[PDB]
Amino acid sequence: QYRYTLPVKAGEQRLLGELTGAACATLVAEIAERHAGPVVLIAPDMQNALRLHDEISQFTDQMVMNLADWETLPYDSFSPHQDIISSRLSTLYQLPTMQRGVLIVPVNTLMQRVCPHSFLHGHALVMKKGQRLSRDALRTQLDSAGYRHVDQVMEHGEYATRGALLDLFPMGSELPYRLDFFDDEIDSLRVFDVDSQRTLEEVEAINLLPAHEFPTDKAAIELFRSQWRDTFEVKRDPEHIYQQVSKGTLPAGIEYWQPLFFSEPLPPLFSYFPANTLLVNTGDLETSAERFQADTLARFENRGVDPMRPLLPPQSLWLRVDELFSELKNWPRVQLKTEHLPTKAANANLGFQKLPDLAVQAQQKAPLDALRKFLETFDGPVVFSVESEGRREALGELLARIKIAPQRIMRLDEASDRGRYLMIGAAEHGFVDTVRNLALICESDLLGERVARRRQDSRRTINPDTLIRNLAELHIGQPVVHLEHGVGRYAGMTTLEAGGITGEYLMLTYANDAKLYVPVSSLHLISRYAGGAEENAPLHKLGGDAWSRARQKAAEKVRDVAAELLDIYAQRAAKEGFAFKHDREQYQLFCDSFPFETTPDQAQAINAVLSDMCQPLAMDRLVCGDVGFGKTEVAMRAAFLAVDNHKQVAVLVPTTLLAQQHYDNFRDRFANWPVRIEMISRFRSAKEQTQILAEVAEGKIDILIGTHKLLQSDVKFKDLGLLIVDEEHRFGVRHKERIKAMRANVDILTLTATPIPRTLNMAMSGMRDLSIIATPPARRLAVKTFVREYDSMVVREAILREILRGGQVYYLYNDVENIQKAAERLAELVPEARIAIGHGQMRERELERVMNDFHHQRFNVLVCTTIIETGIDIPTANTIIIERADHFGLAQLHQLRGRVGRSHHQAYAWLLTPHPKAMTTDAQKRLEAIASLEDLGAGFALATHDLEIRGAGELLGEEQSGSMETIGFSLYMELLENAVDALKAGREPSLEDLTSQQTEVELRMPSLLPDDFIPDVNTRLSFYKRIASAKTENELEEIKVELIDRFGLLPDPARTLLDIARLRQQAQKLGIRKLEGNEKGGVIEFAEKNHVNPAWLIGLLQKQPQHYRLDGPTRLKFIQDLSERKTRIEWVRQFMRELEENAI
Amino acid sequence: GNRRIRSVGEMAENQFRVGLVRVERAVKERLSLGDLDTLMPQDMINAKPI
């Protein structure tokens, strides 16, 4: 027995109470199971409907299905994307006889009118083999369809019923079909010829649906025109929809002139309902129907202008709320509402209390305190409802911390009196079902809230040294403090104009005589001086010296990159690769876990990657494929091959949010195989990194996803076997090579969508392989690009079109300082939306929360910078709005456009531009190019367009994109071959090895052999090797004299390099482990067994307190006026010598 | 009465105006970019396109 009775009568209601969040789901599951007939869930808004479509399906198994609505807005200008109609009609054809299941409609669709009968049981036929129907029923329905009984069916509108076999020549196609009803059932779908009557194919289910929502044939066009001349007025213009339809074409938003085509009023959709449904509500309807009617009326009057393209009244294409509640008194109804309903029949209360304070945080030494104390005091069962599959493991290793191991159940009524279970679904909030004592603890009840940004005391001081009461009496020349800019000199009253207002101002002279005028209405921002130096007061510069001091830096080309890159590649080309082992079935299971199908180009790229990894050479492959084509699953099916040989994949992504997304996706995909995946970035705190690094070094973590924090010289993999650069049109060069440098024979799998020109040319010349991806995966539609001048009405219409569909919006802004004001302005413009700010300059525990909540639909619009430029998935987001698209690269614009789409929904992307009197010519060229290439597979064409204009940079340097007089590939292969042969023969270690054991004497003062001095990169590299490997000062001097002979005078960088290597030679023998230097001083880092006199050390400290300070066990900070580099060098050498004479 | 003379002053002023258009475009972009409250005009205009 159950808790309450369902109603079965005309329109009697049942109010259910107290059902808190994600309990509407379990009630509708219970109702759908206990009811002998359909259940129609009338959600309050499409958003909720979509959410319910995922929640309900978790708690039962009846066919829960939506009703795919036109994703346009009322009286919009876009077509409903014909695929949608192919699923909007089919539902309607089954709806008069569905015998079980749940149909979810919002009131946006519920208030709409739909095709009114006839046309459906006239222009369609859906029939599967499990249609238990007779012959003469089809006979009379085709009779009503107007088909003629022809024994030799050859043309449209013909049917036959002879013996046991039934024939049709349908209105839609040109093929007749044989049916073969047996025993009140259909048994065959024999595609037989127009005349020969010979079966071509036997099928099980047939679909002949009209590809337009309204009839399109000539008679219906004439009817449309006649109704038009009845109601509207025809104007002579080749764009008026009267002449557009008459000429045969269908305009953009033609679906909103639906009722004209039919000459019988559109039925209110309720005629399509079965005999005995049971309308289950959610929230409220007599509040959301009214809101939608008001918005529809607003759109009708808004667009009830424009004599071109006129509109029907909303009564003609929508139910009026009065009619809608005339009809919801014609169905037996159950309302699920979250509040204590008092007492009566047709009313009931289901005790569904909210969960207690469940939250965790790393602040307490016991983080799992709320849960550990709740799960002992709970007599009932507890079901944990984790979100995905992989998240189970991310929740399975967290409840192991308090000795709770959850079984996995399938249906919620498998719970005991006492047990912990978890189930996988999409529920969003918990509940303590105190009726049957059970509890559901959704994963969003373990991550309660974030409460930081609680600040620090005092950002202002009031009435101290200078009250600043200021009834003006100040003299002229008297120093003054502005709170924001510092000390200036008050230079009198003045009068000014400011664009329409004449005001009085105070006159303040800062440094360089740059004057600041402050209003007299706001003189309280100004205080008197306090240092007691009214004659010795300083003077700041307004606006700082950021612009001035930024040119102080550079021009020394402190490091030569050609030698390093040549040595990296030369070490690469020498070592034999690893030839992975491939297990057929043990990778077949990994393939079977993929819930999709590999398109015949993705399965070609995957096969190439595997057959390249299983070769004795070293891969270097680019997987350039257009955005959203499933490039990442190539990385996973290569990562499985790698780590199945115990080989420590390392995935490298160029931003934090992409790192978090890839961490979640990899835990999802590797959710059963014993490979421990971890992510290292700036999200992970310093007590998590210091454990992840220890794990990696010991070799237990087997996939490590990281931002640039990965390549920071403290990350030592045990057995690295595969490197997956993701979104490599970033990273520069040194970041891409900094992981290849430590392990040469590693395999690199370089994933990108628009490769940056250097690594596109270098793929087009054979240095790397290339495996393009085309054939967009399943149901992707090319994103529609629109380029408009910025307009608040355009923004509002775009946002509402997306939101009332239920999706989400990226509103890309790309200016951090003004993004707060931009989000405020947006939230005042569109009150209907929910808006959050996302950019990579927050406290990062706020960015975690923001992009988590975005993934869980807790807000719609995300005002964001270009941190979302790198492959954030979010398959619901289907509208990007680029605020200022004029300054963005072609590759940048393509990646931003690729964020939307990602699923079967047609997704628009707007590139708002400033008004064209201030856009450069190159900007309109870029924008017209990116709007032209609005198709699929456009990524690689755009990349090879960006190359060829930008031109590939140095093949053996930094600076990926630019002409800039590279070295030739034909020269480069010869140079590399010479390096390979000298290296292998010689067997010298890599330059990086000479960097590894190098006692660091980073004194950040240039040290290299200049290019003109030794032009041959190979020979210069040989001197690098022989210098840094010189282990005697005599050997260094022999190098010096040989280099003097072979190339004359020694430039300053060269001789400094020699002296620095000398100091290395000395300090490694001494016990100095890392020595520094700078303009103002430096630090010397000793080893554990050093040759430093500690008595002399304390002597240094106590006779020079202004020069020597110990901060650390071996960190001896020295400070000296090292304003000349030569003085710096002599200082450090003399320091060491003074140490070595006292060495012990 | 239909052909007129533009000597040194008018021609050079035209080129100065051509430069000033690019200057004011750059000024507008630099203003609409962030962090207004610590800008100064010297760090705002470029003396290159004049």
Ligand SMILES: Nc1ncnc2c1ncn2[C@@H]1O[C@H](COP(=O)(O)OP(=O)(O)OP(=O)(O)O)[C@@H](O)[C@H]1O
């Ligand atoms: N063959 C396929 N058929 C259908 N869907 C696919 C197929 N391959 C991938 N997908 C889906 O398409 C989406 C593409 O995301 P994915 O990250 O895999 O590629 P991508 O987005 O191009 O890579 P990146 O994140 O670097 O841009 C994924 O959600 C994936 O589930």
Ligand SMILES: [Mg+2]
């Ligand atoms: Mg990727």
